[PDB]
Amino acid sequence: QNTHELTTRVARALIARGWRLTTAESCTGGNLAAALCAQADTAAFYDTGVVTFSDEAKRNVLQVRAETLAVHSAVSEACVQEMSTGILTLAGADIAIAISGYAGPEGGEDGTPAGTVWFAWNFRGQIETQRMRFTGDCEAVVAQAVRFAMAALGEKLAHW
Amino acid sequence: QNTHELTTRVARALIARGWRLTTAESCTGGNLAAALCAQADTAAFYDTGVVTFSDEAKRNVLQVRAETLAVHSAVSEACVQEMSTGILTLAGADIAIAISGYAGPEGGEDGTPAGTVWFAWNFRGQIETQRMRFTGDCEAVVAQAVRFAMAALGEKLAHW
């Protein structure tokens, strides 16, 4: 499916609710932020994204706890939860999406297969999470992860 | 020219110097961060990028002064200077690139034509800047701005 078309649909839905989105990315590299900024009326629902590609950047920018990274690693439910809280609070937004994963071609040092990606969607402190394992080359994994983040948000918006 | 190939060349040069890059983007939306993360050895030279698409996000994340935005607007030499200092300091990096511009299709409210983009390259507090006006549709402007940021950095690295 087409990322720009999906993102159009989900953005109209955020604008309908008057909700503000923010994003924290690691392996997707800024491509989720890029999809949001490519929208016709970005500022009506979005203005802040971060890319925190390493453990220290997650600790520094998003205040992910050292012990969370030590125990669960950055590609984990706990880490995406803490990433989502950190960017929700920094940006003063209503919803935060955090994505942390291995795009490939290499897997995690823990054996986590390439293509594994954790997501969090944090609505005003109510966090839902999901692990996926995408197939394909690293750029395909990134594109699939960006679209999955938005398509799932589009479904969560009514539920909430 | 090809962004991935250019970025490969400039990244090898940063790694040669042992220098750390960080980035602050507005109109390019995270696509510069995306190019850096798409590199084979990103963490050797990069781990932090921000996207601050509005005036308030620049003030909030990067501490751009209110009076700088009031007097010069966000698409200005002064603003990209302050963006570059804010992200250099936040990320604890050696070099910061800040990009602020109008991708299109609309121009600035001040008459600034669509495609106008300001850049700063901040090496440890020594800032160089440049205005460009790219031709093409908004996505072409974004791609040209990302490549220009990296190609110019590649030239500044010896000079410095």
Side-chain angles (χ1 to χ4, degrees), chain A residues 4 20 26-35 37-38 40 42-43 46-54 56-57 60-61 89-92 106 138-139, chain B residues 4 20 26-35 37-38 40 42-43 46-54 56-57 60-61 89-92 106 138-139:
Chain A
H4 184 51
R20 185 74 132 204
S26 190
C27 63
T28 55
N31 285 289
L32 176 56
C37 297
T42 302
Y46 181 81
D47 63 12
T48 298
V50 300
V51 180
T52 50
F53 200 76
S54 65
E56 180 59 29
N60 185 38
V61 174
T89 304
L90 170 58
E106 321 83 345
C138 53
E139 298 188 19
Chain B
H4 184 51
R20 185 74 132 204
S26 190
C27 63
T28 55
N31 285 289
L32 176 56
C37 297
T42 302
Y46 181 81
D47 63 12
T48 298
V50 300
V51 180
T52 50
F53 200 76
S54 65
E56 180 59 29
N60 185 38
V61 174
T89 304
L90 170 58
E106 321 83 345
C138 53
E139 298 188 19

